[PDB]
Enzyme design. Structure first.
Site, mmCIF file in Angstrom:
data_model
loop_
_atom_site.group_PDB
_atom_site.id
_atom_site.type_symbol
_atom_site.label_atom_id
_atom_site.label_comp_id
_atom_site.label_asym_id
_atom_site.label_seq_id
_atom_site.Cartn_x
_atom_site.Cartn_y
_atom_site.Cartn_z
ATOM 1 N N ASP A 121 0.846 -1.194 0.000
ATOM 2 C CA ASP A 121 0.000 0.000 0.000
ATOM 3 C C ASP A 121 0.892 1.258 0.000
ATOM 4 N N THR A 159 -6.808 3.947 -1.761
ATOM 5 C CA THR A 159 -6.544 2.547 -1.455
ATOM 6 C C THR A 159 -7.692 1.597 -1.903
ATOM 7 N N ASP A 308 -0.655 -0.144 -4.924
ATOM 8 C CA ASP A 308 -1.953 0.437 -5.277
ATOM 9 C C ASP A 308 -1.887 1.902 -5.785
ATOM 10 N N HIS A 309 -1.003 2.718 -5.204
ATOM 11 C CA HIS A 309 -0.868 4.159 -5.547
ATOM 12 C C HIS A 309 0.411 4.613 -4.853
ATOM 13 N N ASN A 685 -24.939 10.277 -21.748
ATOM 14 C CA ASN A 685 -25.155 9.634 -20.454
ATOM 15 C C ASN A 685 -23.821 9.321 -19.748
ATOM 16 N N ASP A 687 -21.316 7.384 -19.914
ATOM 17 C CA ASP A 687 -20.905 6.011 -19.609
ATOM 18 C C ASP A 687 -19.593 5.593 -20.281
HETATM 19 C C1 LIG Z 1 -15.710 -1.449 -18.397
HETATM 20 O O1 LIG Z 1 -16.018 -2.853 -18.345
HETATM 21 C C2 LIG Z 1 -17.306 -3.123 -17.839
HETATM 22 C C3 LIG Z 1 -17.515 -4.634 -17.747
HETATM 23 O O2 LIG Z 1 -17.593 -5.100 -19.077
HETATM 24 C C4 LIG Z 1 -18.383 -2.454 -18.704
HETATM 25 O O3 LIG Z 1 -19.565 -2.504 -17.939
HETATM 26 C C5 LIG Z 1 -20.628 -3.249 -18.525
HETATM 27 O O4 LIG Z 1 -21.310 -2.493 -19.508
HETATM 28 C C6 LIG Z 1 -22.548 -2.969 -20.035
HETATM 29 C C7 LIG Z 1 -23.265 -1.825 -20.777
HETATM 30 O O5 LIG Z 1 -23.268 -0.613 -20.018
HETATM 31 C C8 LIG Z 1 -23.507 -3.583 -18.996
HETATM 32 O O6 LIG Z 1 -24.409 -4.440 -19.696
HETATM 33 C C9 LIG Z 1 -25.767 -4.363 -19.176
HETATM 34 O O7 LIG Z 1 -26.075 -5.479 -18.352
HETATM 35 C C10 LIG Z 1 -27.283 -5.305 -17.627
HETATM 36 C C11 LIG Z 1 -27.397 -6.327 -16.490
HETATM 37 O O8 LIG Z 1 -26.646 -5.778 -15.425
HETATM 38 C C12 LIG Z 1 -26.451 -6.662 -14.288
HETATM 39 O O9 LIG Z 1 -25.757 -7.879 -14.585
HETATM 40 C C13 LIG Z 1 -24.345 -7.785 -14.814
HETATM 41 C C14 LIG Z 1 -23.774 -9.182 -15.081
HETATM 42 O O10 LIG Z 1 -23.632 -9.957 -13.900
HETATM 43 C C15 LIG Z 1 -23.637 -7.062 -13.649
HETATM 44 O O11 LIG Z 1 -22.247 -6.926 -13.866
HETATM 45 C C16 LIG Z 1 -24.270 -5.688 -13.375
HETATM 46 O O12 LIG Z 1 -23.566 -5.066 -12.307
HETATM 47 C C17 LIG Z 1 -23.763 -3.629 -12.204
HETATM 48 O O13 LIG Z 1 -24.785 -3.256 -11.282
HETATM 49 C C18 LIG Z 1 -24.588 -3.736 -9.949
HETATM 50 C C19 LIG Z 1 -25.755 -3.349 -9.041
HETATM 51 O O14 LIG Z 1 -26.590 -2.398 -9.668
HETATM 52 C C20 LIG Z 1 -23.243 -3.271 -9.360
HETATM 53 O O15 LIG Z 1 -22.912 -4.059 -8.230
HETATM 54 C C21 LIG Z 1 -22.069 -3.315 -10.358
HETATM 55 O O16 LIG Z 1 -21.026 -2.492 -9.858
HETATM 56 C C22 LIG Z 1 -22.458 -2.909 -11.796
HETATM 57 O O17 LIG Z 1 -22.645 -1.493 -11.832
HETATM 58 C C23 LIG Z 1 -22.130 -0.786 -12.993
HETATM 59 O O18 LIG Z 1 -22.852 -1.054 -14.210
HETATM 60 C C24 LIG Z 1 -24.205 -0.563 -14.272
HETATM 61 C C25 LIG Z 1 -24.898 -1.007 -15.571
HETATM 62 O O19 LIG Z 1 -25.080 -2.417 -15.570
HETATM 63 C C26 LIG Z 1 -24.245 0.962 -14.024
HETATM 64 O O20 LIG Z 1 -25.581 1.433 -14.024
HETATM 65 C C27 LIG Z 1 -23.534 1.296 -12.690
HETATM 66 O O21 LIG Z 1 -23.471 2.680 -12.419
HETATM 67 C C28 LIG Z 1 -22.107 0.725 -12.662
HETATM 68 O O22 LIG Z 1 -21.288 1.476 -13.550
HETATM 69 C C29 LIG Z 1 -25.785 -5.872 -13.132
HETATM 70 O O23 LIG Z 1 -26.013 -6.477 -11.868
HETATM 71 C C30 LIG Z 1 -28.469 -5.310 -18.604
HETATM 72 O O24 LIG Z 1 -29.653 -5.092 -17.863
HETATM 73 C C31 LIG Z 1 -28.286 -4.245 -19.718
HETATM 74 O O25 LIG Z 1 -29.266 -4.391 -20.757
HETATM 75 C C32 LIG Z 1 -30.061 -3.179 -20.982
HETATM 76 O O26 LIG Z 1 -29.657 -2.470 -22.144
HETATM 77 C C33 LIG Z 1 -29.625 -3.388 -23.236
HETATM 78 C C34 LIG Z 1 -28.775 -2.911 -24.414
HETATM 79 O O27 LIG Z 1 -28.067 -4.043 -24.865
HETATM 80 C C35 LIG Z 1 -31.037 -3.819 -23.658
HETATM 81 O O28 LIG Z 1 -30.933 -4.952 -24.498
HETATM 82 C C36 LIG Z 1 -31.928 -4.180 -22.460
HETATM 83 O O29 LIG Z 1 -33.255 -3.897 -22.846
HETATM 84 C C37 LIG Z 1 -31.578 -3.458 -21.136
HETATM 85 O O30 LIG Z 1 -32.325 -2.242 -21.040
HETATM 86 C C38 LIG Z 1 -33.320 -2.274 -19.968
HETATM 87 O O31 LIG Z 1 -32.896 -1.673 -18.737
HETATM 88 C C39 LIG Z 1 -32.751 -0.249 -18.752
HETATM 89 C C40 LIG Z 1 -32.162 0.246 -17.425
HETATM 90 O O32 LIG Z 1 -33.100 0.139 -16.369
HETATM 91 C C41 LIG Z 1 -34.088 0.423 -19.117
HETATM 92 O O33 LIG Z 1 -33.938 1.829 -19.192
HETATM 93 C C42 LIG Z 1 -34.635 -0.141 -20.442
HETATM 94 O O34 LIG Z 1 -35.884 0.457 -20.774
HETATM 95 C C43 LIG Z 1 -34.680 -1.686 -20.406
HETATM 96 O O35 LIG Z 1 -35.686 -2.146 -19.519
HETATM 97 C C44 LIG Z 1 -26.834 -4.211 -20.280
HETATM 98 O O36 LIG Z 1 -26.631 -5.193 -21.281
HETATM 99 C C45 LIG Z 1 -22.777 -4.349 -17.882
HETATM 100 O O37 LIG Z 1 -23.652 -4.608 -16.806
HETATM 101 C C46 LIG Z 1 -21.549 -3.602 -17.350
HETATM 102 N N1 LIG Z 1 -20.855 -4.399 -16.340
HETATM 103 C C47 LIG Z 1 -20.247 -3.924 -15.235
HETATM 104 C C48 LIG Z 1 -19.597 -4.954 -14.335
HETATM 105 O O38 LIG Z 1 -20.153 -2.726 -14.919
HETATM 106 C C49 LIG Z 1 -18.075 -0.992 -18.944
HETATM 107 O O39 LIG Z 1 -18.908 -0.527 -19.983
HETATM 108 C C50 LIG Z 1 -16.624 -0.744 -19.388
HETATM 109 N N2 LIG Z 1 -16.399 0.698 -19.445
HETATM 110 C C51 LIG Z 1 -15.879 1.227 -20.562
HETATM 111 C C52 LIG Z 1 -15.694 2.716 -20.562
HETATM 112 O O40 LIG Z 1 -15.544 0.552 -21.571
HETATM 113 C C1 XEO Z 2 -3.660 -6.878 -5.802
HETATM 114 C C2 XEO Z 2 -4.642 -7.981 -6.048
HETATM 115 C C3 XEO Z 2 -4.860 -8.433 -7.402
HETATM 116 C C4 XEO Z 2 -5.777 -9.467 -7.692
HETATM 117 C C5 XEO Z 2 -6.470 -10.057 -6.615
HETATM 118 N N1 XEO Z 2 -6.308 -9.665 -5.320
HETATM 119 C C6 XEO Z 2 -5.394 -8.612 -4.985
HETATM 120 N N2 XEO Z 2 -5.251 -8.252 -3.720
HETATM 121 C C7 XEO Z 2 -5.980 -7.023 -3.372
HETATM 122 C C8 XEO Z 2 -5.499 -6.468 -2.044
HETATM 123 N N3 XEO Z 2 -5.488 -7.491 -0.974
HETATM 124 C C9 XEO Z 2 -5.922 -7.259 0.374
HETATM 125 O O1 XEO Z 2 -5.793 -8.098 1.232
HETATM 126 C C10 XEO Z 2 -6.521 -6.004 0.723
HETATM 127 C C11 XEO Z 2 -6.174 -5.171 1.726
HETATM 128 N N4 XEO Z 2 -7.059 -4.093 1.705
HETATM 129 C C12 XEO Z 2 -6.947 -2.943 2.566
HETATM 130 C C13 XEO Z 2 -7.673 -3.080 3.856
HETATM 131 O O2 XEO Z 2 -8.330 -4.081 4.047
HETATM 132 N N5 XEO Z 2 -7.548 -1.990 4.793
HETATM 133 C C14 XEO Z 2 -8.245 -2.051 6.088
HETATM 134 C C15 XEO Z 2 -6.758 -0.765 4.581
HETATM 135 C C16 XEO Z 2 -7.987 -4.246 0.664
HETATM 136 C C17 XEO Z 2 -9.033 -3.402 0.239
HETATM 137 C C18 XEO Z 2 -9.778 -3.864 -0.828
HETATM 138 CL CL1 XEO Z 2 -11.071 -2.812 -1.377
HETATM 139 C C19 XEO Z 2 -9.538 -5.064 -1.511
HETATM 140 C C20 XEO Z 2 -8.462 -5.896 -1.080
HETATM 141 C C21 XEO Z 2 -7.674 -5.464 0.013
HETATM 142 C C22 XEO Z 2 -4.888 -8.796 -1.349
HETATM 143 C C23 XEO Z 2 -5.461 -9.274 -2.684
HETATM 144 CA CA CA Z 3 -22.889 6.959 -23.903
HETATM 145 ZN ZN ZN Z 4 -3.062 5.956 2.426
#
Ligand SMILES: *[C@@H]1O[C@H](CO)[C@@H](O[C@@H]2O[C@H](CO)[C@@H](O[C@@H]3O[C@H](CO[C@H]4O[C@H](CO)[C@@H](O)[C@H](O[C@H]5O[C@H](CO)[C@@H](O)[C@H](O)[C@@H]5O[C@H]5O[C@H](CO)[C@@H](O)[C@H](O)[C@@H]5O)[C@@H]4O)[C@@H](O)[C@H](O[C@H]4O[C@H](CO)[C@@H](O)[C@H](O)[C@@H]4O[C@H]4O[C@H](CO)[C@@H](O)[C@H](O)[C@@H]4O)[C@@H]3O)[C@H](O)[C@H]2NC(C)=O)[C@H](O)[C@H]1NC(C)=O
Ligand code: XEO
Ligand code: CA
Ligand code: ZN
Ligand code: NA
Ligand code: NA
EC number: 3.1.4.39
Length: 805
Positions: A121, A159, A308-309, A685, A687
């Site tokens: 870290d 971190t 990490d940074h 939007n 994204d």
């Molecule tokens: C970086 O890499 C990542 C990973 O590849 C890229 O992110 C992906 O981008 C995709 C497009 O934006 C997106 O695909 C969508 O999947 C939807 C299902 O989502 C769930 O399932 C997945 C799979 O397990 C899961 O990963 C998702 O997790 C998100 O949300 C949870 C909880 O909310 C979080 O814990 C998690 O962090 C993650 O959040 C992030 O992504 C969401 C968007 O999913 C953001 O809103 C957050 O802020 C955050 O950034 C989910 O649990 C699916 O529903 C989508 O389909 C819609 O659109 C399609 C178009 O193809 C359409 O066919 C459908 O009709 C549908 O639309 C309907 O829903 C709309 C919304 O309510 C509604 O308005 C409409 O009218 C329709 O009803 C879509 O296919 C994918 O989920 C994410 N994955 C992740 C991990 O983020 C990212 O783009 C890359 N970035 C760059 C810059 O390249």
């Molecule tokens: C680098 C790596 C690559 C691929 C898979 N895994 C990895 N690592 C991640 C860091 N590891 C830790 O044990 C972590 C320690 N802290 C700090 C923490 O707990 N504090 C209370 C400050 C974390 C905080 C977050 Cl959000 C996530 C993981 C850790 C080991 C595994």
């Molecule tokens: Ca866009």
């Molecule tokens: Zn620090």
């Protein structure tokens, strides 16, 4: 509730987690107050310390000792890491010459080289060179394995966002951990560094490596250690797991050190007190490598040493106070420090207004050490907007500074001398990467890369298919001796039309004019050849970009430039041209000042019109290929085609005209010619992804001409600048930007001055990877080069940072 009455005998550091109420014996039980009563006695032994001495050798096994020097300790796998050196005449790993590891040299029953992730870290990249005298073990990993001179963290360079980025390959906006501290308005819940909400699984998005491993049947060590378990014990526990039977033994392990971050916060990044924490981390690395050597695993295991940074000099007197800018300071909540995030204190306040908050924070003091942004206006390279946990109003703080709400926050909370969190291109925030082992290259230095790329490689190291992530798989193939993932280029989805002359002038009613009424066989055939693509090899050096979505577009050729013109958005998706070192800049002749010309290859119905711009009092227009760079007076007329025009705010035309008239030539002089690809971006939007047409929120007034959110340019030349851009034999060199298309230049405090004093500084802030532009446009660049595809992937992830050495 835990019925902590069970026992840890024979279960110390168990790999599966037992469910409540039964008590736990795993490396995280402390952090949950869930350990069995005898965990300390049985699992956290300390008697006699961590090292063998001469007079412990042969000793009768005493089970109370932290580690053993008895004769049976190798078979039990629990010797002190220095046992063979002290008792058996062996050398320390660091003392052995390094010898290439051409193949894994693993014991019988190892199905793959295990991976050990050693994460530190706050380990600033310059510590590798500046601390090299006091870190011999780390120095040997670095010099004998594969190393980058630094690795770029993600923003914010905090971190939790960075460790979880490392584990997932995702930007914080996608994985959800967007700060050490967060409020989720949908959950109505807060995540903190301190407390029990940060344990709830709903915060954590994407798929971290330990989960990826488990789902695909690769066994994972429990990755995380309660803070009070000492480093020596973490190491011994790892080494003990490494002695488990084949069927029970994990293939991937993690170690985490809270140092040097902990001391760096107290003492600053280079405080004299920082030497000891660096020595101590090196000693832990020595213990691990000695222990692997005793297990005959030192030429079997792949080891990643990764930070990490970094850490910057920051003290309490360098704090800006929002109370010096805002009247209503009690109506806001601030997340403070090395970044600022602002939201309304009360949801029921209808007198809260972000617009007036941003204006009150904008260029208000001559030396102001932060800059406010609506999050969608942040540099796209930060990828820090598309999450409901990221507040609409963001403060980007200058390196070495803090932002706070009121002075009372800073004295009813100088303690600290170091901090991190700033813009991820800041030198002081850069961190480290070293890979060492059979799968990594030998004595190889690789260019700096981003931490989002590592998840793919850790997957490659373990034979796993990565979950979808933000890395570009294949861009780090050059780190590896084998296990490379051999990416293929995506298939073009839309093919272009190649329109010929199809329309007469009088069919157009665009309200445009041009004084082009000034009029030959050899020259006439010449112009026809240009329009059929005769000069195209000159201006389109790397093939045409591929369109990876379904759309309708035309390729248009000209003497000086080629474009892919979208009939849907009514403007080019891309315009490509080459400027040699010898090119000359000309002015726009007076008679051509307001010249716009119908393009007889493109229908009136798929053309922009001049009347829309006349009627829209806020919007003017610019050109993608600039008339300033025309090769001849006759070629200049091509640059005024309505098919080369794009909508631009007058404020933005100041930036663009200076880039086009001054900077392109400057780059061509400095780089020995440049190839330029420019075009619009629509990301309403925020994204980071190309908008479909139904997502466009703004049009030129009374028209279907969509207004871009950003303009991009990609500027390529030969890495060996002794060769011209258009005759390059080897690797390429690129810089790019994604400039925000804003109706004002409020972002630039010096903008009332001449463009020579501010425009280039704006562009540097908005520097971009070609890959960022690919996501935002649905285009795929560099389709036809002589370079290998993995090398082109590396070039597309390149970011030109504009930091000193
Ligand atoms: C970086 O890499 C990542 C990973 O590849 C890229 O992110 C992906 O981008 C995709 C497009 O934006 C997106 O695909 C969508 O999947 C939807 C299902 O989502 C769930 O399932 C997945 C799979 O397990 C899961 O990963 C998702 O997790 C998100 O949300 C949870 C909880 O909310 C979080 O814990 C998690 O962090 C993650 O959040 C992030 O992504 C969401 C968007 O999913 C953001 O809103 C957050 O802020 C955050 O950034 C989910 O649990 C699916 O529903 C989508 O389909 C819609 O659109 C399609 C178009 O193809 C359409 O066919 C459908 O009709 C549908 O639309 C309907 O829903 C709309 C919304 O309510 C509604 O308005 C409409 O009218 C329709 O009803 C879509 O296919 C994918 O989920 C994410 N994955 C992740 C991990 O983020 C990212 O783009 C890359 N970035 C760059 C810059 O390249
Ligand atoms: C680098 C790596 C690559 C691929 C898979 N895994 C990895 N690592 C991640 C860091 N590891 C830790 O044990 C972590 C320690 N802290 C700090 C923490 O707990 N504090 C209370 C400050 C974390 C905080 C977050 Cl959000 C996530 C993981 C850790 C080991 C595994
Ligand atoms: Ca866009
Ligand atoms: Zn620090
Ligand atoms: Na106008
Ligand atoms: Na300004």
């Amino acid at each position: 509730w835990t019925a902590t009455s069970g026992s840890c005998k024979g279960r110390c550091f168990e790999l599966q987690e037992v469910g409540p109420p039964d008590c736990r014996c795993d490396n995280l039980c402390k952090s949950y107050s869930s350990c069995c009563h005898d965990f300390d006695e049985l699992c956290l032994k300390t008697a006699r310390g961590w090292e063998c001495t001469k007079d412990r050798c042969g000793e009768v096994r005493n089970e109370e000792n932290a580690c053993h020097c008895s004769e049976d300790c190798l078979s039990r796998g629990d010797c002190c890491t220095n046992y063979q050196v002290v008792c058996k005449g062996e050398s320390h790993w660091v003392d052995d010459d390094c010898e290439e590891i051409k193949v894994p040299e693993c014991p019988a029953g190892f199905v793959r080289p295990p991976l050990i992730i050693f994460s530190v870290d706050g380990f600033r990249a310059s510590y590798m060179k500046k601390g090299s005298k006091v870190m011999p073990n780390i120095e040997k990993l670095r010099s004998c394995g594969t190393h980058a001179p630094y690795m770029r963290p993600v923003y914010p360079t905090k971190t939790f966002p960075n460790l979880y980025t490392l584990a997932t390959g995702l930007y914080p906006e996608s994985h959800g951990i967007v700060g050490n501290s967060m409020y989720d308005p949908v959950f109505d819940a807060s995540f903190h560094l301190r407390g029990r909400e940060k344990f709830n699984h709903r915060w954590w998005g994407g798929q971290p490596l330990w989960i990826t491993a488990t789902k695909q049947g690769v066994r994972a060590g429990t990755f995380f250690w309660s803070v009070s378990i000492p480093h020596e014990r973490r190491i011994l526990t790892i080494l003990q797991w490494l002695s488990l039977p084949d069927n029970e033994r994990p293939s991937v392990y993690a170690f985490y050190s809270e140092q040097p971050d902990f001391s760096g916060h107290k003492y600053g990044p280079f405080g004299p007190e920082m030497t000891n924490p660096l020595r101590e981390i090196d000693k832990t690395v020595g213990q691990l490598m000695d222990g692997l050597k005793q297990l005959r695993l030192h030429r079997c295991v792949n080891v990643i040493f990764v930070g990490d940074h970094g850490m910057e000099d920051v003290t309490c007197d360098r704090t800006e106070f929002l109370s010096n800018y805002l009247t209503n300071v009690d109506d806001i909540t601030l997340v403070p420090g090395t970044l600022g995030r602002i939201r309304a204190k009360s949801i029921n306040n209808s007198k809260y207004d972000p617009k007036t908050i941003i204006a009150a924070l904008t260029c208000k003091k001559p030396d102001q050490h932060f800059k406010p942004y609506m999050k969608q206006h942040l540099p796209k390279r930060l990828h820090y907007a598309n999450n409901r946990r990221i507040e609409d109003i963001h403060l980007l703080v200058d390196r070495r500074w803090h932002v706070a709400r009121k002075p009372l926050d800073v004295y009813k909370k100088c303690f600290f001398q170091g901090d991190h969190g700033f813009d991820n291109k800041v030198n002081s925030m850069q961190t480290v990467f070293v890979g060492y082992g059979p799968t990594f290259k030998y004595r190889t230095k690789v260019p700096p890369f981003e931490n989002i790329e590592l998840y793919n490689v850790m997957c490659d190291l373990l034979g796993l298919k990565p979950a979808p992530n933000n890395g570009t798989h294949g861009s780090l193939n050059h780190l590896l001796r084998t296990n490379t993932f051999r990416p293929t280029m995506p298939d073009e989805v839309s093919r272009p039309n190649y329109p010929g002359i199809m329309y007469l002038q009088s069919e157009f009613d665009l309200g445009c004019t041009c004084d082009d009424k000034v009029e030959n066989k050899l020259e006439e055939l010449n112009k026809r050849l240009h329009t059929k693509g005769s000069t195209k090899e000159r201006h389109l050096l790397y093939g045409r970009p591929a369109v990876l979505y379904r759309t309708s577009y035309d390729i248009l050729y000209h003497t000086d430039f080629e474009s892919g013109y979208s009939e849907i958005f009514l403007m080019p998706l891309w315009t490509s041209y080459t400027i040699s070192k010898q090119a000359e800049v000309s002015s726009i002749p007076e008679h051509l000042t307001n010249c716009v010309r119908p393009d007889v290859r493109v229908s009136p119905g798929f053309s922009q019109n001049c009347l829309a711009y006349k009627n829209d009092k806020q919007m003017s227009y610019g050109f993608l290929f600039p008339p300033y760079l025309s090769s001849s007076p006759e070629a200049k007329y091509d640059a005024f085609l309505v098919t080369n025009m794009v909508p631009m705010y007058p404020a933005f035309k100041r930036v663009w005209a200076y880039f086009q008239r001054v900077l392109v030539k400057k780059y061509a002089s400095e780089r020995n010619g440049v190839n330029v690809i420019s075009g619009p971006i629509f990301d309403y939007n925020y994204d980071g992804l190309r908008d479909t047409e139904d997502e466009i929120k703004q049009y030129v007034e009374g028209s279907s001409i969509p207004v871009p959110t950003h303009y991009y340019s990609i500027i390529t030349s030969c890495l060996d600048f002794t060769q011209p851009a258009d005759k390059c034999d080897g690797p390429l060199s690129v810089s790019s930007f994604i400039l925000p298309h804003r109706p004002d230049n409020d972002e630039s405090c010096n903008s009332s001055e001449d463009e020579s004093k501010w425009v280039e500084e704006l562009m540097k802030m908005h520097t971009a990877r070609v890959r960022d532009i690919e996501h935002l446009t649905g285009l795929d660049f560099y389709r036809k080069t002589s370079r290998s595809y993995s090398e082109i992937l590396t070039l597309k992830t390149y970011l030109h940072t504009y930091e000193s050495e």
